[PDB]
Design a protein around this ligand. Sequence first.
Ligand code: CA
Ligand code: CA
Ligand code: CA
Length: 481
Amino acid sequence: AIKLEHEIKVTDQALFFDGVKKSVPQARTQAYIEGQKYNYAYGNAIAPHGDAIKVYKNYVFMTWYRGGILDRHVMLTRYNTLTGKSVTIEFPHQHTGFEGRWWVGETHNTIAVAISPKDETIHLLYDMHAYRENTDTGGNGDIRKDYFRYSYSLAGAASVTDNNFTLTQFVKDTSVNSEGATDYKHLTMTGIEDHGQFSRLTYPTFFTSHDGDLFLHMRQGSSHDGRVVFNKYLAEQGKWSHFKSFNVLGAGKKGEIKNWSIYGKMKYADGKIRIGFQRRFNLPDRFRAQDGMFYAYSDDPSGETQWKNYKGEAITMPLVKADEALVMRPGDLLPDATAKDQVSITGGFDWTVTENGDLHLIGQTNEWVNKKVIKKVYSHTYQKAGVGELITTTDFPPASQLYTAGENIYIIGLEQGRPFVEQAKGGTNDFTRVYYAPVGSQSFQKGIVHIHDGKLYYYLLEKGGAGDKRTTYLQIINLDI
Ligand SMILES: [Ca+2]
Ligand SMILES: [Ca+2]
Ligand SMILES: [Ca+2]
């Protein structure tokens, strides 16, 4: 059976935004008040959040911001699964909040972490929400040479002894734009400063191939005109390739009816670089936000060429018209919801492909009437073994992410604060609960998952804390593959 193997405390000082929600004009406008609680613009929990946990050999790497409101330092912790010991590096960068207003917490601004399986370099990307050289921080720091924030290490740093796991392992900024002796933030990944390439980026998320290649993807642009870009770590050269567009910017002048923005994630799944996403058109129509459900995969191990849709048909690369990668229309789940903004798709999208080729996508599609959600529909679209008709069903529980290991797909979450695991054979919608932490165990408020070598690494926020410093834990659960 699935069993909990290890439960480890990461910190009692994880940053939490213990204030109230602010609107974007408030967050942009209001001055600091000394003694205020830590208000926020989007979510209230920046840790664990984002691409913040990775496993490499016997090490679990976890990122987080340290509390409280006056600290906010970027932190990197390494847990050694062989010794049970942890070591943590404190970086000089502090969370800059909403457009430099560091007293308003900004959950888009996550700390992503990856290890190159080839040269054991550690890569960090943090605190970014589409910034650019003329971003107006309202007097809170100069961002002209700090709009893209990248930190990286010496080769072999991933596996040094705990005593040597320090900032000494990381490479300072020594370019003409360097800020000084404690500047660890680089403005580019290629060694070439390039505002056009590295401005307006959000959502750093790394993925790794079977042969040990490391990739990154981000979203570039705005909610009205946005693309996914991705690059590859060049281990032989100690740098990254040029960003490559999965989809164009300015599609309205290149063959689409209008500009659009992309809402999804690239992953490495069943041996291929792939992407799943929904589209925001910003048309005056029945869609309050996103529309459609899309998927494509590359038969190129570098993911640069040979892109295809679910049917195996080649797609235009870079993509201009999203409909080429169509899988289904979530609008069809609410077919009488035709009034302006009556179909509200604002999240809950995910997708996976199992090691047997089974394709799975989930979505949440809400009916929006007089400024309120009046109906929530969860969908599960799947195709067994990559062939045959797509099945879309709404007989799917309220889950927001899908995971895979061996032949199965999994739903993983918190129920009454306790981790559970539901599992289904790939290519089916037949789920059964196979793990639930017992009564008397701890309660958690939030969690992020990382699946590695048949085990579930659950990076969790403990429930019930107070103030702007909370406790996080790492759980290691054997999926019994
Ligand atoms: Ca710098
Ligand atoms: Ca719309
Ligand atoms: Ca649709």
